[PDB]
Amino acid sequence: IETQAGDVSAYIPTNVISITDGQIFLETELFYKGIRPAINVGLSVSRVGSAAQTRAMKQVAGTMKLELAQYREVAAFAQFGSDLDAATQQLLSRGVRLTELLKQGQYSPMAIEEQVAVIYAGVRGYLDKLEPSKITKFENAFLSHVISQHQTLLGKIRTDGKISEEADAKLKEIVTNFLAGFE
Amino acid sequence: QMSFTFASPTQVFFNGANVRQVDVPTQTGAFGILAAHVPTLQVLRPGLVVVHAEDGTTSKYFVSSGSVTVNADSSVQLLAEEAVTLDMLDLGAAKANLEKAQSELLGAADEATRAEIQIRIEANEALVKALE
Amino acid sequence: VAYWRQAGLSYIRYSQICAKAVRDALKTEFKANAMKTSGSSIKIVKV
Amino acid sequence: ATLKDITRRLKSIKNIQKITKSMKMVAAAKYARAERELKPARVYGVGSLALYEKADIKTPEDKKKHLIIGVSSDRGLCGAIHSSVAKQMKSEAANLAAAGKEVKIIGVGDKIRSILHRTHSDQFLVTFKEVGRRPPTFGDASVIALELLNSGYEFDEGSIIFNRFRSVISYKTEEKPIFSLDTISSAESMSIYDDIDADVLRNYQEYSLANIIYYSLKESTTSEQSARMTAMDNASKNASEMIDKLTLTFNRTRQAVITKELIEIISGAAAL
């Protein structure tokens, strides 16, 4: 559904939002603000969107959703975030790293295993020290590294359906080593 | 008797406390003070506060500048400027700084510049005399 | 009386030089606390 | 109104409300910092005022050289602070207009000279800048003392009009006596006291200037952050109330637009 300048209160968007079982909402200021694909959420919700996930993506996306829910309250306080306290500063920084993890190039869909790996790295927080403009370059280099070297780990994730403590320990090890050898 | 209200723009010491002897360690000449004393108003030196609060405590520490004021009823206001402790200082920085002050004093030409390098080198040398 | 008054110097400049020497007299961490507590430049406006 | 007009207005006031909550939290954090910094600087200043209260030297009359030190903020958005400071400053200026002449003054911040471009635009002698951005320290108060003393001017009496901090909500605008020349000091009470030679007492006097200016700057910055937090709390509340009123009129305008368009379509299909 095309809406006319965010008019979700029109006839057809209200009808089909009352019909459909979820919505993926795209507010456009995120698109021109430079986070593409333009799914600008908070209005966006899936009414069954926790049981429709693999347990890897269920764990990582549950913690990631709670982190972004803590982030999106405080962004208007993050435009003046430089002269506030440190707990906010950490929370807003983690949210910025996750929000720039969520952007993705057009016409290149990621498999479940590699996006579990990337969002896992962002949730465990091996990105809080990096620059914001270096997150997407890390993302592409991490995809190249994990596809090239560690095929069996993505095999573990896509065949077990989840991280069960050995993928967890190996991802601790490989993300600590690749953060040790990134730049 | 006397209320040795020590203060500095960083923190405050003994503000409203019965103290028995304060070595008030100044520019005109470092002199002690007890409870009954003549009232006075004097500036400070890079110098050395030694406080003794009623029980033979010997707490010495270093003061850049400031002002001491005592009255008839003995209210000792010692408003220092930068009051550092012996748990706060180092040695080789002061040694290299006094060597730099010696070199710049051998290079000075103007009277205000020579006065600044003399107060720098005498702060450093009374500093090192406090250090050792 | 003082030699620096005969140079034409103010006692507050005297105190600031002694403050710079004492901030140099600190080792690392107390040096950081003092330089954070040191004087930021309030600028001037003349007529 | 139209519908897009009220949509624009609601967007604008929702943004002003969020930014005003942001200013409220920034003022709260800087208020907590200024409050925990206020504890040593309060004792320092009240010790200086206590020694000048026990040595209660009076003011000599029938002379000229007076000095008003306006100490307040550079960047406003903080309530009725600078109004009260300017009121007290010009009241002391009109009181020092009669029988005093040299009411050449010094002030800090952009707001004090900005509230003094009209009435005493001749008499403001020096002005300062970038106060209230960083927290006030002692070395910048030393810069104020050097620009008062080494930039040569002599004064015998006046006031340091400082924003006085009292509480989270309230404040106070009131003066302190700035005893200025040694003759005001060395009149009788220093003759009672000891070691009151001219150079020692005038270096003491310059340090007393730096003392009371340090006390005034930290008191004024704490009062600035408290009243700014109060002003941004009240502005967020007023903006939220106006968002509520404009959302109600947006909804009734929306319903009127839907009913108007519906009556036009039904009238067309019926007159067909």
Sign of torsion over alpha carbons C34, B12, B63, D134: positive
| Residue C8 buriedness (CB in 10 A; 0-12 / 13-18 / 19+) | exposed
Q: Hey, what are A149's tokens? A: 């070297």
Tell whether D145 is within 8 A of chain C (Cβ).
yes
* Residue D156 DSSP class: S
CB D116 within 8 A of CB D135: no
Task: Give phi and psi for D95, each to the nearest 5.
Answer: -70, -35
Any D CB within 8 A of B26 CB: no
Helix axes D198-271, D139-149, angle to 10 degrees: 110
Contact call for B41 and D211, based on CB within 8 A: no
B112 contacts in chain C (CB < 8 Å) = 7-9
Q: What is the DSSP string of D90-106?
A: HHHHHHTTSS-----EE
Task: Please judge whether A76 and D23 are an interchain contact, meaning their C-beta atoms are less than 8 angstroms apart.
Answer: no
Question: Would you list which residues of chain C are within 8 Å, Cβ to Cβ, of chain D?
Answer: 1-2, 5, 10-16, 19, 37-47
Distance from CA of B96 to the nearest CA of C (A): 10
What one-character DSSP code corresponds to residue D152? -
Chains B and C touch (3+ CB pairs under 8 A): yes
d(CA D77, CA D229): 10
- Beta-carbon separation of B41 and D137 below 8 A: no
Measure the CA–CA gap between B129 and B25, rounded to whole angstroms: 14
**Residue D49: beta bridge partners?**
none
* First-to-last C-alpha distance (Å) of chain D: 31
Count of domains forming chain C? 1
Residues 6+ apart with CB under 8 A from B30: B23, B24, B45, B47, B48
**Strands annotated E in D72-167:** 105-107, 124-129, 157-165
User: At CB < 8 A and 24+ separation, what contacts does D103-106 make?
Assistant: D103/D66, D103/D68, D104/D67, D104/D153, D105/D67, D105/D68, D105/D69, D105/D70, D106/D67, D106/D68, D106/D69, D106/D70, D106/D144, D106/D147, D106/D148
Q: Which of residues 67-86 of D touch C (CB under 8 A)?
A: none
Q: Which class for A167: exposed (0-12), middle (13-18), buried (19 or more C-beta within 10 A)?
A: buried
Is A47 designated active site? Answer: yes
Structure tokens at A77: 């306080």
**Shortest CA distance from C43: residue in chain D:** D129
How far apart CA A77 and CA A87 sit, in angstroms, is 13
Alpha-carbon distance of D28 to D232, in angstroms, equals 10
Tokens 């309530």 belong to which residue? D79
Find the helix packing angle between A86-101 and A135-148, rounded to 10°: 60
The angle at the Cα of D219, spanning D173 to D184, to the nearest 5 degrees, equals 75
Please say whether the dihedral angle defined by the alpha carbons of residues D93, D94, D99 and D102, taken in this order, is positive or negative. positive
Give the span between the Cα atoms of B64 and D86, in whole angstroms. Answer: 37
Partner-chain residue, chosen from D44, D192, D204, that has the shortest CB–CB distance to B9: D44
Q: Which residue has the tokens 């020290």?
A: A129
Burial (CB < 10 A; 0-12, 13-18, 19+), residue B81, is: buried
Tell me which chain B residue has its CA closest to the CA of residue C9: B112
Cα–Cα distance list, D112 to A9, B56, D71, D83 (Å) = 50, 52, 8, 9
Contact check, Cβ <8 Å, C10/D126? no
What is the DSSP code (8-state) at residue D168? S
Q: Quick one: which of D156, D161, D171, D165 has its CA closest to D92?
A: D161
Residues D102 and D16 in one domain: no
Peptide bond before A37: cis, by omega within 30 degrees of 0?
yes
Q: Please give the structure tokens belonging to residue A56.
A: 């890897």
Of D44, D50, D195, the CB nearest to B40: D195
Contact D18 A76 (CB under 8 A): yes
Nearest to D128 among C12, C15, C43 (CB): C43
Q: What string of DSSP letters covers B1-58?
A: -EEEEEE-SS-EESTT-B-SEEEE--SS--EEE-SS---EEEE--SEEEEEE-SS---
Residues 6 or more apart from C25 whose CB is under 8 A from it? B62, B84, B89, B90, B93, B94, B127
Query: In degrees, to the nearest 5, what angle opens at C-alpha D5 toward C-alphas D4 and D8?
Result: 85
Residue A45 exposed, middle or buried by CB count within 10 Å (0-12, 13-18, 19+)? exposed
Cα–Cα distance for residue pair D57/D188, rounded to 1 Å:
8
CA distance A135 to A97: 7
Tell me how many residue pairs between chain C and chain D have CB atoms under 8 A apart: 84
Q: Which domain holds residue C20?
A: 1-47
Cross-strand partners of D70: D107, D161
A68: Cβ–Cβ under 8 A, 6 or more apart, which residues?
Answer: A95, A98, A99
The two tokens of residue A21 are 């079982």
Cα gap D105→D49, rounded to integer Å: 22
Instruction: Report residue D47 as tokens.
Output: 């010790």
Dist CA A121 CA A139 (whole Å): 10
- CA dihedral (D18, D24, D27, D31) in degrees, to 10, reads -150
Q: How many domains does chain D have?
A: 2
CA distances (Å), origin D47, targets A57, B64, D225: 64, 19, 24
D18 and D41 together in one domain: no
Q: Which of C17, C27, C33, C38 to probe the B interface (max B CBs under 10 A)?
A: C17
Q: How many interface pairs between B and D have CB atoms less than 8 angstroms apart? A: 73
Distance CA D121, CA B68 (A): 39
Q: Are the C-beta atoms of D132 and D222 separated by less than 8 Å? A: no
Q: Check B116 against C24: CB less than 8 A apart.
A: no
**CA C13 to each of CA B109, C39, D165, D207, D208: distance values in angstroms, whole numbers, following the listed order:** 19, 13, 29, 10, 14
What SS3 string covers chain A?
Answer: CCCCCCCCCCHHHHHHHHHCCEECCCCCHHHHHCCCCCCCCCCCEECCCCCCCCHHHHHHHHHHHHHHHHHCCCCCCCCCHHHCCHHHHHHHHHHHHHHHHCCCCCCCCCCHHHHHHHHHHHHHCCCCCCCHHHHHHHHHHHHHHHHHCCHHHHHHHHHHCCCCCHHHHHHHHHHHHHHHCCC
| AA letter at D49 | L
Q: Which of D158, D73, D171 is nearest to D115 (CA)?
A: D73
Q: Among candidates D211, D109, D221, which has minimal Cα distance to D171?
A: D221
Binary contact (C40, D140; C-beta < 8 A):
yes
For D13, the 3-state DSSP assignment is helix
CA distance B125 to chain D (A): 23
Task: Show the domain range for D165.
Answer: 26-231
Q: Are residues D17 and D53 in the same domain?
A: no
* Amino acid present at D133: R
Neighbours of C32 (CB within 10 A): 11
Beta carbons of A107 and A72 less than 8 angstroms apart: no
Contacts of A159 (CB under 8 A, 6+ apart): none
Nearest Cα to D129, choosing from D115, D150, D112, D151? D112
Annotated catalytic residue within A47, A72, A94, A124: A47
3-class state of residue D73 by DSSP: coil
- Apex CA B17: angle with CA B13 and CA B18, to 5°? 130
Judged on CB neighbours under 10 Å (0-12, 13-18, 19+), D116 is: buried
Euclidean distance between CA atoms B111 and B118, whole angstroms = 10
Q: CB-side exposure of D248: number of CA atoms within 13 Å?
A: 5
All residues of chain C having their beta carbon less than 8 Å from the beta carbon of residue D145 are 10, 12
C-to-N gaps above 2.5 Å in chain A, after residues: none
Rounded to whole angstroms, the Cα distance separating A178 from A149 reads: 12
* Residue found by looking up tokens 């926790």 in the block: A50
What is the phi/psi pair of residue D165, to 5°?
-90, 135
D29 at the A interface (CB within 8 A)? yes
- Distance between CA atoms of residues B61 and D180, nearest Å: 32
Say which DSSP state D11 is in. H
Query: Do D130 and C43 lie within an 8 Å CB cutoff?
Result: yes
The three-state secondary structure class of B108 is coil
